[PDB]
Design a protein around this ligand. Structure first.
Ligand SMILES: Nc1ncnc2c1ncn2[C@@H]1O[C@H](COP(=O)(O)OP(=O)(O)OP(=O)(O)O)[C@@H](O)[C@H]1O
Ligand SMILES: [Mg+2]
Lengths: 458, 115, 173, 83
């Protein structure tokens, strides 16, 4: 019924008879050589022209091709039939197994739950990582965001969070790969299958090789599956491999959609496009979603509009610093920038809160002294300032920790640390219980007992 | 015979319209009579409809719309060889010293592909 | 769409046709100039990169009926500015200007039934009272109208239908 | 009187031999800095190799409503409008 009239990169314009113009977000279909291509409607121009984004490679498209109007949006399989299988943005199986035994398909474009439906929760969720649950602990059903530049450990931290939480947790999980490395998807798939935990996980992969429409819509596909499991009344874990790629795929197509550039050349709709996605990731009186998201920071610029917009949408934010990572302190968490809604004396209790604020104060004072130290050197400092520095350095080392997924990188066995050990250890360091140990005693030790045992052999 | 006409003059930028069949190629050199002196124009872009856009190799003042334009079918060509030694020239290869004409043997186009 | 660039030409053509008392001929002439614009091969030529005057003379060659030195010169003007595809919209604005100048309005009347024609006498008198213009009726029967009638004149509408009244009361939640 | 004038137009176009380009063929409309605008090529496809005069190619980057935007795989300065 329709005719292609323009092809500009990922964008295709189609003309329809004026009595039959497709609705917005309708799926269209066109035969491209020896394969079928889906187009999603974005805008209605005048005169029956409609502007669409190709869910696939647009090369080889002619003008004048006949286009078929499917009467519905993009709809994907949902439910337990998706568990243990790898699916595409279009909801197609991508593993070599057979068809998905769907019973129901849901449109990926949906409204967020109403204000009446939302639910509060203060149940602290423990992690094996000292710095995260000390400085920025988070609750069941909350959102966590890992902010970092290129190559500072977002994926490794998320894999540790998977190992600990999604294996002491008993319900289903959804992992959404959005514009990230295909190698890492294959590695994750296998180590899930070798551990026989795959049958609890639904995996949707929209990796970087894909053309922009796939990277744009795959996040919504993953959210639709997670919403199916939430509305069933379960407690679900949602992991998003890089949320930044969604905004970037918006940027790539926005100019071709004829929209004036904004700010640093971003689409004008950046905040709305991010908000409508983010508002759907919410725990509800019927069921709870716990979410961990990686957030790439372009050029390490935390003041860039995309990270800046993302910050308001999250409950716990962990900021990874290249400057710390180049020291070799891993995980490279910046404790003066990482923060959580849950660091509140009512929920955590007084000892945890006081320990966190003490650590924060000492590290801030160390930042204040470093500019003096750079020019003059430490010898000019006061004898109390030297003690502040001597304790701050030990605190910085004690935030390091060996990870099991970092066993291959470091070669040393991973460590899991209970929260009580973290509070006790940092309180002891700040009180000066360990002022007689060297700094090296604290680097990459699981617990304070391990610090003293390392100190015996220096 | 001049075949084009000037249609715009916006600072140094001069647009010239030719017959559909004889648009000059990019980097070609045109010339016009700016009163009592010749002005050379170098082609930068071929626009649709026989219009071509050029940069004036000289002062643009005094140009009218509708002046006749001659299409020299080569690029800017300059004298080369032993006759050039000890002589001062402008970009067009014309002597800027007062020392008379250059005893040229050849003139080469200034636009060339590298070896 | 071409409306905004078509308006000046429509005014100029109507004004000229008024001075020379040729409005009817101009209408029949613009109809042909618009109809040649719709032809396939001519449309391909219009989308091409021909210099204005060559395109103008080819178009004038096809537009033989056109009054020489008046309509053909209008084609030359529009060819200088490449507005020839706007000709279907240079027409119909000429018709709008004519209808305004002739103080005449087409008005439309849509009902669940073929109206009783005595009703149409009353409706036409009422419209010639609402608007100080002669009103041409071209009423219609429509299944969507449950009962009653819709009166539409320009961009003003007076809904007397049972459908509209229902969906106007159903709004009162 | 509409069908009559329609066929009158179709007669008069032939009388004056105005006719379309063939499919798979077109003309260069404009040339600048190695970007080429081509009219015609109703059967050209996104990413196709378009053979130019000489022995060289342009790559079709945009299929606009009225033209094809392409970039030249080599020297472009010898190309001209109407090739
Ligand atoms: N806990 C850790 N212990 C040791 N090395 C680590 C640790 N975390 C990260 N690294 C080092 O950093 C490298 C990059 O880690 P990772 O892939 O998690 O980064 P990322 O910030 O998510 O990167 P990208 O933006 O490229 O996807 C690892 O291959 C490893 O060398
Ligand atoms: Mg990574």
């Amino acid at each position: 019924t329709g005719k292609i009239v323009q092809v500009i990169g990922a964008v295709v314009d189609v003309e329809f008879p004026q009595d039959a113009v497709p609705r917005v977000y309708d799926a269209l279909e066109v035969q491209n050589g020896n394969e079928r291509l889906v187009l999603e409607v974005q805008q209605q121009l005048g005169g029956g022209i409609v502007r669409t984004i190709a869910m696939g490679s647009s090369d080889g498209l002619r003008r004048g091709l006949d286009v078929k109007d499917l009467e519905h949006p993009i709809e994907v399989p949902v439910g337990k039939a998706t568990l243990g299988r790898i699916m595409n943005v279009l909801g197609e199986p991508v593993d070599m197994k057979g068809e998905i035994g769907e019973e129901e398909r849901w449109a990926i474009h949906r409204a967020a739950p109403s204000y009446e439906e939302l639910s509060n929760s203060q149940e602290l969720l423990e992690t094996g990582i000292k710095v995260i649950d000390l400085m920025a602990p988070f609750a069941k059903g909350g959102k966590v965001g890992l902010f970092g530049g290129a190559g500072v450990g977002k994926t490794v931290n998320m894999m540790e969070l998977i190992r600990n939480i999604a294996i002491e947790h008993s319900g289903y999980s959804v992992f959404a790969g959005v514009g990230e490395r295909t190698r890492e998807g294959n590695d994750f798939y296998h180590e899930m299958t070798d551990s026989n935990v795959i049958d609890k996980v639904s995996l949707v992969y929209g990796q970087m090789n894909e053309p922009p429409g796939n990277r744009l819509r795959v996040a919504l596909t993953g959210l639709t599956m997670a919403e199916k499991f939430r509305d069933e009344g379960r407690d679900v874990l949602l992991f998003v491999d890089n949320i930044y790629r969604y905004t970037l795929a918006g940027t790539e197509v926005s100019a071709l959609l004829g929209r004036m550039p904004s700010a640093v050349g971003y689409q004008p709709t950046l905040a709305e496009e991010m908000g409508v996605l983010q508002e759907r990731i919410t725990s509800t009186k019927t069921g709870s979603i716990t979410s961990v998201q990686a957030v790439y920071v372009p050029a390490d610029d935390l003041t860039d509009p995309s990270p800046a917009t993302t910050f308001a949408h999250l409950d716990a934010t962990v900021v990874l610093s290249r400057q710390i990572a180049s020291l070799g302190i891993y995980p490279a968490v910046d404790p003066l920038d990482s923060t959580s809604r849950q660091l509140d004396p009512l929920v955590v209790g007084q000892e945890h809160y006081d320990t966190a604020r003490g650590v924060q104060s000492i590290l801030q004072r160390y930042q204040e002294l470093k500019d003096i130290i750079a020019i003059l050197g430490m010898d000019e400092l006061s004898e109390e300032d030297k003690l502040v520095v001597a304790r701050a350095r030990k605190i910085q080392r004690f935030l390091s920790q060996p990870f099991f997924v970092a066993e291959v990188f470091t070669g040393s066995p991973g460590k899991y640390v209970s929260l009580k050990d973290t509070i006790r250890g940092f309180k002891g360091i700040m009180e000066g219980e360990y002022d007689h140990l060297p700094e090296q005693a604290f680097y990459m030790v699981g617990s304070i007992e391990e610090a003293v045992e390392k100190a015996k052999k220096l | 015979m001049a075949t084009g006409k000037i249609v715009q003059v916006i600072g140094a930028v001069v647009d010239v319209e030719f017959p559909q069949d004889a648009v000059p190629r990019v980097y070609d050199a045109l010339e016009v009579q700016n009163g009592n002196e010749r002005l050379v124009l170098e082609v930068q872009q071929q626009l649709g409809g026989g219009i071509v856009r050029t940069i004036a190799m000289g002062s643009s003042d005094g140009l009218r719309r509708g002046l006749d334009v001659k299409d020299l079918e080569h690029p800017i060509e300059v004298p080369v060889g032993k006759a050039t030694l000890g002589r001062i020239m402008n970009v067009l290869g014309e002597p800027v010293d007062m020392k008379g004409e250059i005893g040229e043997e050849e003139r080469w186009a200034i636009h060339r592909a590298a070896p | 769409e071409f409306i905004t660039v078509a308006r000046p030409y429509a005014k100029a053509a109507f004004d000229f046709a008024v001075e020379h008392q040729s409005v009817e001929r101009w209408q029949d002439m613009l109809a042909f100039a618009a109809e040649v614009t719709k032809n396939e091969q001519m449309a391909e030529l219009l989308s091409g990169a021909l210099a204005p005057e060559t395109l103008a003379e080819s178009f004038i060659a096809v537009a033989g009926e056109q009054l020489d030195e008046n309509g053909q010169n209008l084609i030359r003007v529009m060819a200088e500015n490449g507005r020839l595809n706007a000709l279907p919209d240079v027409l119909e604005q000429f018709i709008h200007l004519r209808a305004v100048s002739e103080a005449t309005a087409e008005v439309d009347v849509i009902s669940a039934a073929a109206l009783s024609e005595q009703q149409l006498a009353k409706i036409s008198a009422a419209m010639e009272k609402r608007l100080s213009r002669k009103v041409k009726l071209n009423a219609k029967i429509d299944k969507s109208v449950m009962a009653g009638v819709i009166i539409r004149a320009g961009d003003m509408v007076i809904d007397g239908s049972v459908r509209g009244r229902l969906e106007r009361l159903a709004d009162v939640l | 009187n509409s069908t009559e004038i329609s066929e009158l137009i179709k007669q008069r176009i032939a009388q004056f031999n105005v006719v379309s380009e063939a499919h798979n063929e077109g003309t260069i409309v404009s040339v600048s800095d190695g970007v080429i605008r081509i009219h015609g090529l109703a059967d050209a496809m996104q990413g196709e190799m378009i053979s130019l005069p000489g022995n060289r190619y342009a790559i079709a980057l945009n299929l606009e409503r009225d033209s094809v935007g392409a970039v030249v795989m080599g020297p472009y300065a010898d190309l001209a409008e109407g090739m």
